[PDB]
Protein backbone atom coordinates (compact mmCIF):
# COMPACT_ATOMS: atom_id res chain seq x y z
CA UNK A 1 0.00 0.00 0.00
CA UNK A 2 0.77 3.48 0.17
CA UNK A 3 3.84 5.09 1.92
CA UNK A 4 2.45 6.95 5.05
CA UNK A 5 3.87 9.39 7.88
CA UNK A 6 2.53 9.85 10.95
CA UNK A 7 3.06 13.10 12.35
CA UNK A 8 1.93 14.98 15.70
CA UNK A 9 1.88 18.54 16.30
CA UNK A 10 2.84 19.76 19.58
CA UNK A 11 2.82 23.31 20.94
CA UNK A 12 1.37 25.46 23.91
CA UNK A 13 -2.33 26.79 23.65
CA UNK A 14 -2.67 29.41 20.78
CA UNK A 15 0.54 29.04 18.61
CA UNK A 16 -0.87 27.90 15.80
CA UNK A 17 -1.21 24.19 15.64
CA UNK A 18 -4.57 23.84 14.50
CA UNK A 19 -3.95 26.90 11.75
CA UNK A 20 -0.99 25.25 10.75
CA UNK A 21 -2.36 21.92 9.95
CA UNK A 22 -5.70 23.16 8.38
CA UNK A 23 -3.64 25.14 6.24
CA UNK A 24 -2.05 22.65 4.76
CA UNK A 25 -4.63 20.05 4.91
CA UNK A 26 -7.36 23.12 3.23
CA UNK A 27 -5.18 25.86 1.91
CA UNK A 28 -7.27 28.52 4.17
CA UNK A 29 -6.01 30.52 7.21
CA UNK A 30 -8.33 29.77 10.03
CA UNK A 31 -9.06 33.02 12.81
CA UNK A 32 -10.92 30.74 15.04
CA UNK A 33 -10.25 26.87 15.55
CA UNK A 34 -12.00 25.31 18.97
CA UNK A 35 -8.56 24.42 21.18
CA UNK A 36 -10.66 21.87 22.93
CA UNK A 37 -10.73 19.84 19.73
CA UNK A 38 -8.04 16.83 19.65
CA UNK A 39 -8.32 14.92 16.42
CA UNK A 40 -6.03 13.32 13.32
CA UNK A 41 -6.09 14.49 9.55
CA UNK A 42 -5.29 13.13 6.62
CA UNK A 43 -3.09 14.21 3.65
CA UNK A 44 -2.18 12.43 0.11
CA UNK A 45 1.07 14.59 -1.09
CA UNK A 46 4.18 14.55 -3.24
CA UNK A 47 7.61 14.56 -1.93
CA UNK A 48 11.04 14.30 -3.71
CA UNK A 49 8.28 12.52 -6.06
CA UNK A 50 7.11 9.92 -3.54
CA UNK A 51 3.66 9.65 -3.19
CA UNK A 52 2.06 9.24 0.55
CA UNK A 53 -0.29 9.85 3.13
CA UNK A 54 0.42 11.97 6.21
CA UNK A 55 -1.46 10.94 9.35
CA UNK A 56 -1.06 14.14 11.04
CA UNK A 57 -2.51 14.49 14.76
CA UNK A 58 -3.24 18.08 16.20
CA UNK A 59 -2.64 17.91 19.84
CA UNK A 60 -5.50 19.88 21.84
CA UNK A 61 -7.11 20.01 24.98
CA UNK A 62 -6.05 19.52 28.62
CA UNK A 63 -6.81 15.87 29.27
CA UNK A 64 -3.46 15.19 28.03
CA UNK A 65 -3.12 10.70 28.15
CA UNK A 66 -5.60 9.72 26.43
CA UNK A 67 -6.93 6.91 23.98
CA UNK A 68 -5.64 9.00 20.66
CA UNK A 69 -2.86 11.11 22.12
CA UNK A 70 -1.09 7.88 23.77
CA UNK A 71 -0.99 6.12 20.44
CA UNK A 72 0.16 9.13 18.45
CA UNK A 73 2.93 9.41 20.54
CA UNK A 74 3.74 6.14 21.26
CA UNK A 75 3.37 5.13 17.45
CA UNK A 76 4.36 8.61 15.97
CA UNK A 77 7.30 8.89 13.26
CA UNK A 78 7.80 12.60 13.60
CA UNK A 79 7.30 15.62 16.16
CA UNK A 80 6.70 19.57 14.90
CA UNK A 81 7.37 21.28 17.99
CA UNK A 82 5.91 24.64 17.59
CA UNK A 83 5.65 28.05 19.18
CA UNK A 84 4.69 31.27 18.27
CA UNK A 85 7.64 34.36 18.14
CA UNK A 86 5.22 36.93 19.66
CA UNK A 87 4.75 34.64 22.30
CA UNK A 88 8.20 34.17 25.06
CA UNK A 89 6.29 31.23 27.19
CA UNK A 90 5.23 29.37 24.26
CA UNK A 91 9.34 29.02 23.10
CA UNK A 92 9.67 28.74 26.91
CA UNK A 93 7.64 25.63 26.63
CA UNK A 94 9.19 23.80 24.26
CA UNK A 95 11.94 22.13 26.41
CA UNK A 96 9.05 20.20 28.21
CA UNK A 97 7.42 18.87 25.16
CA UNK A 98 10.87 17.70 23.92
CA UNK A 99 11.79 16.13 26.78
CA UNK A 100 8.24 13.89 26.93
CA UNK A 101 8.76 12.77 23.54
CA UNK A 102 12.21 11.55 24.07
CA UNK A 103 11.19 9.88 27.32
CA UNK A 104 8.39 8.29 25.48
CA UNK A 105 10.59 6.83 22.32
CA UNK A 106 13.56 5.91 25.35
CA UNK A 107 15.37 8.02 22.62
CA UNK A 108 18.07 10.92 22.43
CA UNK A 109 17.30 11.05 18.22
CA UNK A 110 13.08 11.11 17.65
CA UNK A 111 12.96 13.08 14.39
CA UNK A 112 11.65 16.71 14.96
CA UNK A 113 11.64 20.02 13.68
CA UNK A 114 11.36 23.32 15.65
CA UNK A 115 8.35 25.48 14.42
CA UNK A 116 8.26 29.49 15.15
CA UNK A 117 5.19 30.41 13.77
CA UNK A 118 3.37 33.53 13.50
CA UNK A 119 6.31 35.36 11.27
CA UNK A 120 3.98 37.81 9.64
CA UNK A 121 3.25 39.57 12.74
CA UNK A 122 5.08 42.63 14.80
CA UNK A 123 5.38 41.97 17.76
CA UNK A 124 8.25 39.42 18.06
CA UNK A 125 9.66 38.85 21.45
CA UNK A 126 11.63 35.61 20.24
CA UNK A 127 14.42 36.20 18.28
CA UNK A 128 15.77 34.27 15.26
CA UNK A 129 18.75 33.80 17.32
CA UNK A 130 16.93 32.20 20.48
CA UNK A 131 15.35 29.72 17.80
CA UNK A 132 18.44 28.69 16.34
CA UNK A 133 20.48 28.36 19.17
CA UNK A 134 17.25 26.12 20.57
CA UNK A 135 17.33 23.90 17.31
CA UNK A 136 21.47 23.83 16.55
CA UNK A 137 21.35 22.41 20.71
CA UNK A 138 18.87 19.74 19.74
CA UNK A 139 20.57 18.97 16.58
CA UNK A 140 17.33 19.75 14.43
CA UNK A 141 16.16 21.83 11.83
CA UNK A 142 14.13 25.26 12.40
CA UNK A 143 11.65 26.38 9.93
CA UNK A 144 9.53 29.73 10.28
CA UNK A 145 6.18 29.39 9.44
CA UNK A 146 2.94 32.12 8.62
CA UNK A 147 -0.58 30.08 8.81
CA UNK A 148 -1.75 33.67 8.04
CA UNK A 149 0.44 33.70 5.25
CA UNK A 150 1.28 30.28 4.54
CA UNK A 151 5.06 31.01 4.38
CA UNK A 152 7.00 28.29 5.39
CA UNK A 153 4.14 25.60 6.16
CA UNK A 154 4.46 23.17 3.48
CA UNK A 155 8.54 23.50 4.48
CA UNK A 156 8.02 22.64 7.90
CA UNK A 157 5.93 19.60 6.74
CA UNK A 158 8.16 18.26 4.16
CA UNK A 159 10.90 18.79 6.30
CA UNK A 160 9.73 16.96 9.08
CA UNK A 161 9.36 14.06 6.34
CA UNK A 162 12.57 14.33 5.43
CA UNK A 163 13.99 14.14 8.93
CA UNK A 164 12.21 10.94 9.57
CA UNK A 165 13.73 9.17 5.96
CA UNK A 166 17.01 10.34 7.50
CA UNK A 167 16.21 7.84 10.52
CA UNK A 168 14.13 5.35 9.14
C1 LIG B 1 -4.95 25.20 24.12
C2 LIG B 1 -5.19 23.74 24.18
C3 LIG B 1 -4.00 22.95 23.53
O1 LIG B 1 -3.79 23.14 22.28
N1 LIG B 1 -3.24 22.12 24.27
C4 LIG B 1 -3.09 22.18 25.75
C5 LIG B 1 -1.65 22.16 26.13
N2 LIG B 1 -0.98 20.97 25.55
C6 LIG B 1 0.38 20.90 26.11
C7 LIG B 1 1.09 19.56 26.00
C8 LIG B 1 1.51 18.88 27.14
C9 LIG B 1 2.07 17.60 27.07
C10 LIG B 1 2.51 16.96 28.28
C11 LIG B 1 2.88 16.46 29.29
C12 LIG B 1 3.35 15.84 30.52
C13 LIG B 1 2.15 16.94 25.82
C14 LIG B 1 2.59 15.51 25.77
C15 LIG B 1 1.77 14.49 26.22
O2 LIG B 1 0.51 14.77 26.68
C16 LIG B 1 2.21 13.15 26.18
C17 LIG B 1 3.46 12.85 25.65
C18 LIG B 1 4.27 13.87 25.14
C19 LIG B 1 3.84 15.18 25.24
CL1 LIG B 1 4.82 16.41 24.51
C20 LIG B 1 1.73 17.64 24.69
F1 LIG B 1 1.86 17.04 23.48
C21 LIG B 1 1.23 18.93 24.75
O3 LIG B 1 0.99 19.64 23.55
C22 LIG B 1 -0.42 19.90 23.47
C23 LIG B 1 -0.98 21.16 24.09
C24 LIG B 1 -2.41 21.14 23.55
N1 LIG C 1 -1.22 36.41 12.73
C1 LIG C 1 -1.29 35.06 12.87
N2 LIG C 1 -2.16 34.48 13.63
C2 LIG C 1 -2.10 33.09 13.71
C3 LIG C 1 -1.09 32.33 13.00
N3 LIG C 1 -1.33 31.01 13.33
C4 LIG C 1 -2.35 30.98 14.12
N4 LIG C 1 -2.86 32.28 14.35
C5 LIG C 1 -3.99 32.61 15.20
O1 LIG C 1 -3.65 32.32 16.54
C6 LIG C 1 -4.77 31.78 17.20
C7 LIG C 1 -4.47 30.42 17.72
O2 LIG C 1 -4.32 29.46 16.64
P1 LIG C 1 -4.66 27.94 16.77
O3 LIG C 1 -4.40 27.34 15.51
O4 LIG C 1 -6.07 27.79 17.36
O5 LIG C 1 -3.61 27.47 17.91
P2 LIG C 1 -3.50 26.08 18.70
O6 LIG C 1 -4.13 26.34 20.07
O7 LIG C 1 -1.98 25.86 18.75
O8 LIG C 1 -4.23 25.05 17.87
C8 LIG C 1 -5.96 31.79 16.23
O9 LIG C 1 -6.67 33.03 16.40
C9 LIG C 1 -5.27 31.78 14.89
O10 LIG C 1 -5.96 32.43 13.83
C10 LIG C 1 -0.17 32.95 12.24
O11 LIG C 1 0.78 32.47 11.58
N5 LIG C 1 -0.26 34.35 12.25
MG1 LIG D 1 -5.81 23.77 18.21
Known amino acids: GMTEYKLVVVGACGVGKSALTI ?16 DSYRKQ ?18 EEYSAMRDQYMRTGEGFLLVFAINNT ?5 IHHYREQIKRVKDSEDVPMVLVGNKSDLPSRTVD ?17 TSAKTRQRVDDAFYTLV ?7
Open 23 to 38: QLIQNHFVDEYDPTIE
Open 45 to 62: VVIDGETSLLDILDTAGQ
Open 89 to 93: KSFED
Open 128 to 144: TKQAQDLARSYGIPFIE
Open 162 to 168: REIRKHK
